[PDB]
Each structure stands twice: as structure tokens, then as C-alpha cells.
Design an enzyme around this catalytic site. Structure first.
Site, mmCIF file in Angstrom:
data_model
loop_
_atom_site.group_PDB
_atom_site.id
_atom_site.type_symbol
_atom_site.label_atom_id
_atom_site.label_comp_id
_atom_site.label_asym_id
_atom_site.label_seq_id
_atom_site.Cartn_x
_atom_site.Cartn_y
_atom_site.Cartn_z
ATOM 1 N N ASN A 77 -12.998 -0.847 -7.319
ATOM 2 C CA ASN A 77 -14.116 -0.342 -7.131
ATOM 3 C C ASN A 77 -14.404 0.587 -7.933
ATOM 4 O O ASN A 77 -15.285 1.504 -7.843
ATOM 5 C CB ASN A 77 -14.589 1.165 -6.347
ATOM 6 C CG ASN A 77 -13.271 0.137 -4.755
ATOM 7 O OD1 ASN A 77 -14.304 -0.184 -3.720
ATOM 8 N ND2 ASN A 77 -11.904 0.656 -4.137
ATOM 9 N N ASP B 222 1.203 -1.495 -0.020
ATOM 10 C CA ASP B 222 -0.064 -0.083 0.443
ATOM 11 C C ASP B 222 0.808 1.425 -0.021
ATOM 12 O O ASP B 222 2.267 1.151 -0.442
ATOM 13 C CB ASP B 222 -0.519 -0.168 1.187
ATOM 14 C CG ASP B 222 -2.431 0.214 0.944
ATOM 15 O OD1 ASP B 222 -2.095 1.660 0.406
ATOM 16 O OD2 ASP B 222 -2.724 -0.405 1.325
ATOM 17 N N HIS C 243 -4.151 5.701 2.903
ATOM 18 C CA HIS C 243 -4.428 4.417 2.443
ATOM 19 C C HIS C 243 -4.312 3.736 3.751
ATOM 20 O O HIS C 243 -4.874 2.640 3.942
ATOM 21 C CB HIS C 243 -4.864 4.515 0.958
ATOM 22 C CG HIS C 243 -5.203 3.982 0.419
ATOM 23 N ND1 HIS C 243 -5.171 2.450 -0.245
ATOM 24 C CD2 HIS C 243 -7.012 4.454 -0.145
ATOM 25 C CE1 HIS C 243 -6.811 2.868 -1.168
ATOM 26 N NE2 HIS C 243 -7.696 3.595 -1.022
ATOM 27 N N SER D 237 -10.890 -2.082 -1.397
ATOM 28 C CA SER D 237 -9.384 -1.457 -0.740
ATOM 29 C C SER D 237 -10.534 -1.826 0.729
ATOM 30 O O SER D 237 -8.904 -1.924 1.853
ATOM 31 C CB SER D 237 -8.826 -0.271 -0.844
ATOM 32 O OG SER D 237 -8.067 -0.285 0.115
#
Ligand SMILES: [Ca+2]
Ligand SMILES: [Ca+2]
Ligand SMILES: [Ca+2]
Ligand SMILES: [Ca+2]
Length: 279
Positions: A161, A39, A69, A224
Site C-alpha cells: 500500500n 497473518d 487483520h 491486503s
């Protein structure tokens, strides 16, 4: 063990039913397992990680998470308040710059880094990697996730997404790794969630409360945030000796809450991650 007033996601993965707010889990809590979070990095110093998180690799100037994130995904995996595996070791691999984006070649290097780096770490209960990242189909990115899985790491990857078939995204479209869609607190497929035959499991994805940079907290929504939930469950299940890296995804899908989710396209699995824990 029971955490009262838990984030809805944690409560849901220890429930047959939606609408509860107590997370039930075995107190072992994924001790002696490792989850790699590939990440934007992890704010290791967040009181919520209790010294259990460390940056192990970066491909940028700093290993710090200037984004948030990866600190937020790390938290959903193994933070004391917002984590599934409250006692797991978190390894932060920064393949994404602080703007949240990264070259596919860097992402691949990150996945190959974990496949090796685990031999440098104490993970007697097993190794999990949480990939809360995506883009277009790439056999090269798919093959990297396949290699990480093959190396003996449970790979959990966001479906994406795009509210489209995840067949067209990577590493979501890799058959050998655990592809995670997102559900909301009312057991509906999250409007953004990718779907398709390549999905293995759903996780709580919408309005996921977790850790953030500045030693803070916030809610954010995506496949996520479903992923770190499934990543963590696998760490927890592996520490219970109930599954292994290689078979964890199957195990999670065999033991999942079935047919509970609404707005699931025909030919997409109707399976919600469930810890099947009985207090
Ligand atoms: Ca909540
Ligand atoms: Ca996040
Ligand atoms: Ca992330
Ligand atoms: Ca995240």
C-alpha cells in the site's frame, strides 16, 4: 447461487460491470480446497466461519488473533457472508504479532510451514495461501514465497500500500507468485495500491467489509484485502477443477475483466479478478 446485498468486492468479482451488489458463484463455493491465511491469526470461533476455520500454527504466546487483520482477511477468503469461497477450509498461520508486525525470519518459517503442513491436511481440490503482508525487498522472503508456490500451493500476495512500484517490496516482487493490486468500487486503482510489471491481477481493495475480532465486522482498505479476494477466487476456481495451484494466477489473469480499471500506470496489467460465473 446468488447472495443479494453482498459486499461490493464479492459482487464485483462475479461481474463484468461495477455498481452491482449481488455475488453470483457456483454453489460448490470452493468446498474441498484449503486457503492458508498467513497473518495475525484467525478468530476461528466467529459465527461467520461456521467451524470451517482453525489456527494450525503460531510463532507467539497465543495463536489467537488479538489484532483483527488476519480475521478480516480470513473472512474475505471464506466467511459465509463476506467470503469468495464460502465452503473452503481456512488454516490460520500466525506469523504477525497482535501489533500486526513480524520478523522476516518468522514470516519465512510460516511460508515453509504451509508448504509442509498441507501434507497434513485434506485439500483434494488444492491449496491456496493468502499473504496480506509485506515489507522491503528481500530475496530470502521472495525465495520463501517461490518455495511455497513450487510446493504446489497457489500463493497470493499483496502488492503493498505504498503507491509505488511493487518491485521494491517482498514477497510482492517474487515473479513466481500471484501479486495483487487493489481497486475501489468505481473501478479505479486504490490510491494506496502498489503497481508495476510484477503485478499479475487487481482485486477489490478499498472499503472491504469482512469479519473482525469479538465476533464483529468492519470495513478496511489495502492490497491486503484485494489479496484474500484473489486467494478465495483461486480456491473457488480450483474446486470447480477450472485451474490448479501452479497455473491459477495465469488462469485468473486470462479470465479477468480487462481494461476496466482507471489510473493504472503504463506497464501495469489492467486486469480485475473475475469468477466468470454464468448463473
Ligand atoms: Ca459495501
Ligand atoms: Ca484486513
Ligand atoms: Ca491480513
Ligand atoms: Ca486482513
Amino acid at each position: 447461487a446468488a447472495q443479494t446485498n453482498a459486499p461490493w468486492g464479492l459482487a464485483r468479482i462475479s461481474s463484468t460491470s461495477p455498481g452491482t451488489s449481488t455475488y453470483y458463484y457456483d454453489e460448490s463455493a470452493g468446498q474441498g480446497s484449503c486457503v492458508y491465511v498467513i497473518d495475525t491469526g484467525i478468530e476461528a470461533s466467529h459465527p461467520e466461519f461456521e467451524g470451517r476455520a482453525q489456527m494450525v500454527k503460531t510463532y507467539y504466546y497465543s495463536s489467537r488473533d488479538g489484532n483483527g487483520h488476519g480475521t478480516h482477511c480470513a473472512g474475505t477468503v471464506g466467511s459465509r457472508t463476506y467470503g469468495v469461497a464460502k465452503k473452503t477450509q481456512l488454516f490460520g498461520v500466525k506469523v504477525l504479532d497482535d501489533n500486526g508486525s513480524g520478523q522476516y525470519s518468522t514470516i519465512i518459517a510460516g511460508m515453509d510451514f504451509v508448504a509442509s503442513d498441507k501434507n497434513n491436511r485434506n485439500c483434494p481440490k488444492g491449496v491456496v495461501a493468502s499473504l496480506s503482508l509485506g515489507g522491503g525487498y528481500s530475496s530470502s522472503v521472495n525465495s520463501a514465497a517461490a518455495r511455497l508456490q513450487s510446493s504446489g500451493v497457489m500463493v497470493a500476495v499483496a502488492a503493498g500500500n505504498n503507491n509505488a512500484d511493487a518491485r521494491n517490496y517482498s514477497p510482492a516482487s517474487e515473479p513466481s507468485v500471484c501479486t495483487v493490486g487493489a481497486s475501489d468500487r468505481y473501478d479505479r486503482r486504490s490510491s494506496f495500491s502498489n503497481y508495476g510489471s510484477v503485478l499479475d491481477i487487481f482485486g477489490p481493495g478499498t472499503s472491504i467489509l469482512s469479519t473482525w475480532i469479538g465476533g464483529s465486522t468492519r470495513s478496511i482498505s489495502g492490497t491486503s484485502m484485494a489479496t484474500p479476494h484473489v486467494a478465495g477466487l483461486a480456491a473457488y476456481l480450483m474446486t470447480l477443477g477450472k485451474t490448479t495451484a501452479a497455473s491459477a494466477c495465469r488462469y485468473i489473469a486470462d479470465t479477468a475483466n480487462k481494461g476496466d480499471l482507471s489510473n493504472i500506470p503504463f506497464g501495469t496489467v489492467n486486469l480485475l479478478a473475475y469468477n466468470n460465473y454464468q448463473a
